[PDB]
Structures are given as C-alpha cells and as structure tokens.
Design a protein around this ligand. Structure first.
Ligand code: ZN
Length: 227
C-alpha cells in the first residue's frame, strides 16, 4: 500500500511497518515492552506501525503480538542509517509519562501535515524536526488528537502534547502562545498555538517531536521527506 511505501523506513530513529498475521479481531502488539499502534492496512490485514528508537542497534527485532486466538511473536529487521532541579525532575517526569500514554483510538491520518507552512531546518541528540519560521507563525495539528499535556518548562518552554491515538503523539515546544486547553479534542489542521522562543532557546525555534510506542522518530518520514 501507499502507507506501507511511505512509512516503512526501518532504521534507528525510523519506522517499521510489520505484518501481524492477523485479519479478524484487533490484535495488540508490543515492542520492547511498550504498546504499539495497530491499524488495518487500507481496511485489510492488521499491521503494526512501530517506532524505532535512535539508540537501537541495527539487526533483527521482535514484536510481541497478542490475540484471543493465541499470542505470537513477529520478527522484523532494523537496517542502518538554576534554579531548583526538583522542578526539572518533575517536568521530565510529566513529559515522560505523556509519551507513554496509550489511548485506544485510531489516528485520523498516518501521513501527517506539516504543522507550519515553512521550510524544514534542523534534522533528526536532536530528537525532532525544526522549521525555519518566525515567531507568531500559527502551529497546526498534523492529525486530529487530544491535548494530553501543556507545560511551561525550564528547557522546552511552552510545550503542548497532542495524542493522535495508540501512542502516536506529536509534541511542540518553545511556543510563544498556546491556544488549546488540556483535554481538548482538535481536528487535523486545528491551531495549537504560535511559534516562539520560550524556555532555553536562542531566537525563534519551531520544534516538532513525533513519538510512537515511546520512541521519538523522524517527523520527516510522516510528511514524505525522508531522507
Ligand atoms: Zn529543534
């Protein structure tokens, strides 16, 4: 499928699309103990869309599949490519918990829109994708989702997490303005807020993280810009 052609980039920091050998009731899947996004491929076979951490050594990998008719493992391959620290600890803990959220819903779209209309800057260590846009540029939801975290953090500044469903999560930080509320359900294209330089940034810094199964992956894969 087109979504297999787009998303199957199995490298460290990348994405593996794995045939689950299931077509009936929805199976559950786990990679390194973390629950993984499971969707029908254009309404047909069940596939996992698996985030591969950047620290993953190339080689064979295992996915645990759970189904009523019996559990099984499916292998795939990764190829090569100031002031109180107590606050900081708490802020790290909140963000860590947010990426580990696994809500039951299916993502509205797996191919994501660019969150800002501007050129890409820094890759994807740098755990996301930058865009060269000025402060005040509106940031739009790459897919539909629920706002599961809003913070004003020491390092990341004004930060918003959007849960697209089943661990598929966008994060945006250093915002000047956040226009959404905690728990708010936003459509694809909904305005989340405005680009800024809050937290530890040197000038306007539009930063976008994409996570799958608690693994930060290259957002360029989802917009068709891998690389
Ligand atoms: Zn960045």
């Amino acid at each position: 499928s087109f979504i297999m052609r787009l998303l199957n980039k199995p490298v460290p920091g990348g994405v593996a699309v794995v045939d689950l050998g299931e077509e009936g009731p929805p199976p559950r899947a786990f990679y390194q103990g973390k629950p993984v996004l499971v969707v029908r491929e254009e309404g047909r076979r069940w596939i996992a869309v698996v985030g591969i951490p950047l620290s993953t050594k190339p080689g064979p990998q295992k996915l645990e599949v759970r189904a009523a008719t019996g559990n099984h493992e499916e292998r795939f391959s990764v190829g090569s490519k100031p002031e109180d620290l107590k606050r900081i600890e708490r802020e790290l803990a909140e963000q860590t918990a947010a990426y580990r959220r696994f809500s039951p819903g299916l993502p509205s779209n797996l191919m994501l829109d660019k969150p800002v209309d501007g050129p890409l800057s820094s890759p994807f260590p740098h755990s996301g994708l930058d865009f060269a846009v000025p402060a005040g540029t509106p940031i739009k939801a790459p897919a539909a989702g629920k706002v599961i975290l809003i913070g004003d953090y020491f390092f990341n500044g004004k930060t918003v997490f959007v849960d697209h469903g089943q661990g598929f999560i966008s994060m945006f930080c250093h915002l000047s303005k956040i226009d959404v509320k905690l728990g708010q359900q936003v459509p694809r294209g909904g305005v989340l807020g405005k680009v800024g330089a809050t937290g530890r940034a040197t000038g306007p810094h539009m930063h976008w993280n994409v996570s799958l199964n608690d693994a930060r992956v290259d957002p360029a894969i989802f917009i068709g810009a891998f690389q």
